[PDB]
Write a protein that binds this DNA or RNA. Structure first.
Lengths: 590, 591, 75
RNA sequence: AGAGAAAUCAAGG
RNA sequence: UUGCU
């Protein structure tokens, strides 16, 4: 580690990107997730009281507690209902113009949202086939389920889809009718909405232990999109959120104005422990109600926003395929209630292969809304500093007159987050008394230098579609890293060398291959990069197509250019591609 | 009063055109009307006529128009055949039909004016009011029935719309004082047997045999036909009988057959039917009661070979071993970028670690290429590189056993043969060492029985990406010197001050970059949950140290022990232990 | 992931899929080109022994892309 | 055997 | 069948 701590011409902040082992393979989770899922579920009941009392906490419906119940010395799941009303009220007067765009979004964009965007979600557990399917197929069967039971066509608007969800649960009995003709009652359909599909969070770096993420049912996914999109509208207009923009300019402005005269500054960098193991859905369901009520939204808007959180209060988390039990050298997987374990307090909450729990959250359900619950707690008279936060990651800049004033504000910041159910991680929060050093969302700050370090290295290999698309896609990825500061003048140039040399190898343009042997035998000179010719792109020409640029420099003559650009050739016939149609835009056989 | 974006001349023009006061919300409706007239003025700014106060008539096309503001452009329908209409959103955008009638001049003028009009409505909190004037009421578009309402309220103490009756107030809570980190924490050093080498390949000990130029088959045939193999050190993990597996694959590959049939020794080498044998053995000797599984990870100490691996990996070579095609140069910025990379390649190219990276690059690529199908036979994957003169360099061979992987994270049995320089029993306890004779030259051949997943092979198939991190550090040193000296010098070789063996001594930049790459390579090939957890929690301690150097003060919350988050990740990883000892060697207090 | 399969896919005997045609010979210089599905060589063969289009069509395809080239080289 | 790390692979038929 | 420094 002493090799990563220079003392001359370079500071340790510059070498923070040397503390990343992203070159090697990412960790992967193995086997059952039941222990991890149950550990996630049992934490908020352990943290609800100062002394661990899971049995009493399991009877709590709304996780509202008195101020004396909040654990100052440890994690404290649950919220204070009086604080949430006041803190959300404080968040309304401040950033009032910011929340005016939310009202415009509700009155204009919200009725115009299409439910077809639900097809771009992650893997969805089917309530029909009782197995995981991708989103677009899951949406298609869910919509047909709604149409047949409700005897009407569903409008393209997302509101119409959500209205159908509310209407179908009013039916006594529901059927699919394909062949399969499977049949649900109201309680069975209700259990499908409550069910959360837990799964391992694969390819996650920076952690010793594997966590789990949960996905919601496609029936409730329509309601979840509305509140998340509304939360995204607020976060893009409030300066205390680092989620929007994407270029991470929020920390840049704070770095520039950090210069203060004759003032005790301060920079607090830290994370939140058990961020998804302590938040209560009723906490941010009350926060949303306060926002809409004071904004003047109608009653049906209030009911629409509260439903997704009300379902989450009744969530049925799927434990998985069981806890591992060992007699000798053999292993067996058993459900929670079969034999005693460390999770015996939750046996009474087992409902089939799922388990019911009213407190706590999961990582991949409400990210943007959880950020809002953190931002409203910052809005107090005592907290006069600048705060930036993105989920369980925050930075706060103190600007006080005395050191004791900063410490009072630092503790007030810690306690005000505990009023909404958010606990600072004591071992992960560092306060630098002279402000000018801090980290936030893999952005290391030192005075005016804000170092952007990528959490994952861009893939320096061709995508795998065709040489023209792969070259354009690969260089665009390098261009993004340079633009965001994750790469610099030399690293970006080295990135092409690694990419170009790997791009040539994948298409048999390197060494002696069958493709290469043909060209030097039939006197076919390499004229394109995928053919083995010298790379024509440069550091300042990342955005230029190879075919067009080679024509300008004379690399591609007129004769070859006409052949490769023939629209009737038999070979072929950012997110999008600036690639001209040529004979090298072929499709690999399946 | 009149809004700023609304001109005074327009304000009094419409003052008497309609009974603004004798309406519902007359003030907002008046401003909306002034928007429409202002749009007409921007349309006819230089043809278009005016009837406002059909309301505008083009003379070039002899068409009458009537500007109407609509909340949603997609909700446009022909209002009337008497007069054509242009519909504009409150944000300033126009319908696709609007762009045809107008052009860039008028369209750009109308937008921006509607933007500041949208700013005015946001500022005065009238967003609902303009929409109720631009269009009709939105009525009720969502309702919750009685039965669904009852279900939603089973697990909460509030109604669908929460109305708690508590008085909004923020209570005062007694907190805990923040303490100052006066000294940097020390990391726990684990005790136990030294960690063995547990990477896929050998690393610094890797060597190669020079072969006459040719193809892979010719190189294998050259080695197989005139080599002598005899065991000098046998390990229980890798029985010496698996040498027949390698020689059979050497003979098959030399004859043009990378895939050969199973032999008897393949069962031990690749663990065929090991799943059933261990399951049968476990069930036969199973007695007692079922208990919750408790897995233990054995703690191991820092091995002595890590330091000597760093020294060997930094050693000089003869060839460059990093031959990446030079990119094009068109601008002055481009030329500087290529010069920095060219100089960086010279610094780290002629190093042992660069050659080892190439060996890992080739070995992972060849092994990965044979794991795209299901094969019940054994495939031989030679690790052969070629020097500029063309001579084949035989680093070793990887044998891929029967594989039927369904997921990319499943392990595939491998038998890896490598040429090595110096044998160390405690560094390679699971390796079997064989003495190899090739034309009066002694070589040492290692055999290990390993399983290694497809995903991990893919990541190491582009291990050349490890050069990125040391290049970034080297680039920022040169650019920092260029900025302070106001002139760029590609040949600058400054001295870097570091804490070495507990003492502060300067060291050359070129040498510092070389063994940054050596350390980064070791971290890459030993990356695991211990490595990921260690580095992630080490960054704040590294940040804390840098704060202490420049006299800044570090403060912590009540129950703050940042070293605990790092100590829990130090179990048995050698480089993690090596990185931990480097931190403890550094001073923990700054004055 | 398509990126984990490109190296294997390209090296298959017939990696590319092409519409059936007669202007591409089955064998050119001892290398079998077709059998639809063809081998990776075929794009290289077309760049030298293919049928040429009109020069006007070439400029039409490389018009939007050509503009961004002179824009870079004029500033 | 081994890979590995909180539980899996060492086919499944 | 087999050739990235």
């Amino acid at each position: 580690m002493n090799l990563f701590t220079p003392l001359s011409e370079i500071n340790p902040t510059t070498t923070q990107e040397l503390l990343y082992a992203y070159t090697g393979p990412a960790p992967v989770a193995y086997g059952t997730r039941t222990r991890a899922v149950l550990e996630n579920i049992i934490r908020p009941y352990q943290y609800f009281y100062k002394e661990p009392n899971v049995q009493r906490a399991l009877d709590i419906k709304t996780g509202c507690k008195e101020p004396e119940d909040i654990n100052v010395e440890g994690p404290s799941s649950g919220f204070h209902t009086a604080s949430v009303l006041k803190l959300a009220d404080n968040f309304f007067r401040k950033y009032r113009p910011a929340m005016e765009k939310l009202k415009y979004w509700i009155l204009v964009k919200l009725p115009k949202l299409k439910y077809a965007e639900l097809s771009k979600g992650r893997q969805t557990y089917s309530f029909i086939h009782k197995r995981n399917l991708p989103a677009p197929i899951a949406l298609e069967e869910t919509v047909e389920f709604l149409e047949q039971n409700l005897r009407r066509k569903i409008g393209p608007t997302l509101l119409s889809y959500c209205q159908a969800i509310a209407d179908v649960m009013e039916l006594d009995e529901t059927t699919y009718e394909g062949t399969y003709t499977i049949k649900f009652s109201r309680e069975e359909l209700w259990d499908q909405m409550r069910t959360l599909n837990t799964m391992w969070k694969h390819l996650e770096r920076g952690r010793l232990n594997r966590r789990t993420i949960a996905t919601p049912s496609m029936l409730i996914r329509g309601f979840v999109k509305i509140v998340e999109d509304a939360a995204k509208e607020i976060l893009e207009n409030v300066p205390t959120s680092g989620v929007p923009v994407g270029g991470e300019e929020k920390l840049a402005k704070l770095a520039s104005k950090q210069t203060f005269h004759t003032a005790v500054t301060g920079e607090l960098s830290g994370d939140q422990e058990k961020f998804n193991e302590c938040l209560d859905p009723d906490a941010m369901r009350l926060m949303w109600t306060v926002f809409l009520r004071k904004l003047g939204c109608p009653d049906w808007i209030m009911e629409l926003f509260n439903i997704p959180f009300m379902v989450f209060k009744s969530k049925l988390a799927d434990m998985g395929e069981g806890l591992v039990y060992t007699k000798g050298k053999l292993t067996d997987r058993k459900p929670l209630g079969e034999m005693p374990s460390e999770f015996d307090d939750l046996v009474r909450n087992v409902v089939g292969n799922s388990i019911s729990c009213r407190l706590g959250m999961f990582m991949g359900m409400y990210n943007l809304t959880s950020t809002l619950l953190a931002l409203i707690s910052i809005e107090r008279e005592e907290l006069t500093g600048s705060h930036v936060e993105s989920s369980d990651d925050f930075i706060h800049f103190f600007n006080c007159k005395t050191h004791e004033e900063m410490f009072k504000q630092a503790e007030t910041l810690r306690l005000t987050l505990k009023l909404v159910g958010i606990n600072m991680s004591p071992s992960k929060c560092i306060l630098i008394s002279p402000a000018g050093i801090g980290e936030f969302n893999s952005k290391f700050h030192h005075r005016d230098f804000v170092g952007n370090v990528a959490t994952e290295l861009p893939a320096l290999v061709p995508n795998g579609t065709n040489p023209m698309t792969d070259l354009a896609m690969g260089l665009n990825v390098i261009k993004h890293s340079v633009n965001t500061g994750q790469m610099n003048l030399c690293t970006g140039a080295l990135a092409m060398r690694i990419f170009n040399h790997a791009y040539k190898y994948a298409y048999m343009a390197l060494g002696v291959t069958r493709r290469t042997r043909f060209m030097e035998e039939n006197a076919i000179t390499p004229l394109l990069t995928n053919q083995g010719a010298s790379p024509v792109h440069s550091f300042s020409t990342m955005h230029l197509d190879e075919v067009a640029l080679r024509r300008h420099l004379g690399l591609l003559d007129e004769e070859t250019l006409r052949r490769i650009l023939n629209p009737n050739n038999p070979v072929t016939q950012i997110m999008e591609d600036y690639s001209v149609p040529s004979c090298f835009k072929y499709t690999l056989s399946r | 009063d009149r809004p700023d974006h609304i001109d005074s001349r327009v304000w009094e023009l419409s003052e008497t055109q309609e009974d603004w006061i004798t309406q519902v919300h007359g003030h907002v409706r008046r401003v909306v009307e002034c928007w429409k007239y202002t749009i007409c003025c921007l349309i006819s700014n230089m043809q278009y006529d005016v009837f406002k106060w059909p309301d505008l008539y083009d003379n070039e096309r002899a068409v009458a128009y009537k500007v109407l503001l609509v909340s949603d452009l997609s909700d446009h329908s022909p209002t009337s055949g008497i007069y054509h209409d242009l519909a504009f959103n409150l944000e300033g955008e126009a319908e696709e039909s609007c762009a045809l009638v107008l052009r860039g001049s008028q369209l750009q003028d109308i937008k921006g004016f509607l933007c500041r009009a949208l700013e005015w409505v946001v500022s005065n909190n009238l967003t609902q009011e303009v929409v109720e004037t631009i269009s009709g009421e939105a009525k009720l578009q969502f309702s919750v029935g009685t039965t669904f309402r009852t279900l939603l309220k089973r697990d909460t103490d509030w109604d669908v719309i929460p109305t708690p009756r508590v008085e909004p107030n923020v209570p005062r809570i007694e907190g805990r004082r923040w303490t100052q980190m006066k000294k940097l924490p020390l990391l726990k050093e684990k005790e136990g047997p030294p960690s063995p080498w547990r990477a896929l390949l050998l690393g610094a000990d890797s060597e190669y045999i020079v072969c006459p130029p040719g193809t892979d088959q010719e190189a294998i045939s050259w080695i197989h036909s005139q080599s002598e193999i005899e065991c000098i050190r046998e390990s229980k993990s890798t029985p010496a009988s698996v040498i027949t597996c390698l020689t059979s694959s050497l003979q098959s590959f030399a004859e043009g057959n990378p895939v050969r049939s199973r032999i008897h020794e393949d069962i031990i080498a690749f663990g065929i039917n090991k799943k059933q044998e261990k399951k049968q053995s476990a069930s036969s000797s199973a007695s007692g009661e079922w208990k919750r599984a408790e897995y233990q990870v054995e703690e191991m100490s820092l091995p002595p070979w890590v330091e000597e691996e760093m020294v060997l990996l930094r050693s000089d070579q003869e060839d460059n071993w990093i031959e990446l095609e030079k990119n094009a140069i068109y601008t002055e910025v481009d030329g500087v970028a290529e010069g920095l990379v060219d100089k960086y390649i010279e610094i780290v190219g002629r190093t042992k670690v660069a050659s080892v990276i190439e060996k890992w690059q080739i070995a992972a690529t060849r092994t990965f290429s044979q794991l795209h199908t299901d094969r019940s036979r054994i495939t031989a994957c030679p690790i052969i590189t070629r020097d500029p003169s063309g001579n084949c360099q035989f680093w070793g061979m990887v044998l891929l056993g029967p594989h039927h992987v369904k997921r990319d994270t499943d392990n595939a049995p491998l038998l890896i043969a490598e040429i090595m320089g110096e044998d160390t029993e405690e560094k390679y306890p699971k390796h079997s060492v064989f003495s190899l004779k090739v034309e009066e030259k002694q070589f040492l051949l290692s055999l290990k029985i390993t399983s290694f997943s497809r995903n991990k092979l893919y990541t190491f198939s582009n291990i050349r990406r490890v050069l990125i991190q040391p290049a970034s550090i080297y680039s920022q040193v040169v650019l920092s010197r260029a900025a302070e000296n106001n002139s760029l010098n590609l040949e600058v070789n400054p001295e870097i001050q570091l804490y070495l063996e507990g003492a502060q001594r300067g060291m050359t930049l070129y040498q510092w970059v070389r063994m940054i790459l050596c350390l980064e390579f070791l971290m890459a090939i030993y990356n695991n949950p211990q490595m990921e957890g260690f580095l992630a929690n080490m960054r704040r301690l590294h940040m804390s140290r840098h704060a202490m150097m420049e006299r800044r003060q570090v403060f912590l919350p009540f129950g703050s022990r940042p070293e605990d988050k790092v100590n829990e990740c130090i179990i048995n990883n050698p480089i993690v232990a090596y990185l931990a000892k480097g931190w403890n060697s550094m001073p923990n207090v700054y004055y | 992931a398509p990126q984990m399969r490109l190296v294997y896919s390209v090296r298959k005997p017939w990696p590319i899929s092409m519409t059936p045609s007669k202007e591409i010979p089955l064998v050119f210089n001892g290398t079998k080109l077709k059998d639809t599905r063809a081998n990776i060589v075929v794009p290289d063969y077309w760049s030298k022994y293919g049928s040429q289009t009109s020069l006007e069509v070439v400029n039409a395809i490389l018009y939007a892309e050509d503009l961004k080239v002179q824009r870079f080289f004029s500033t």
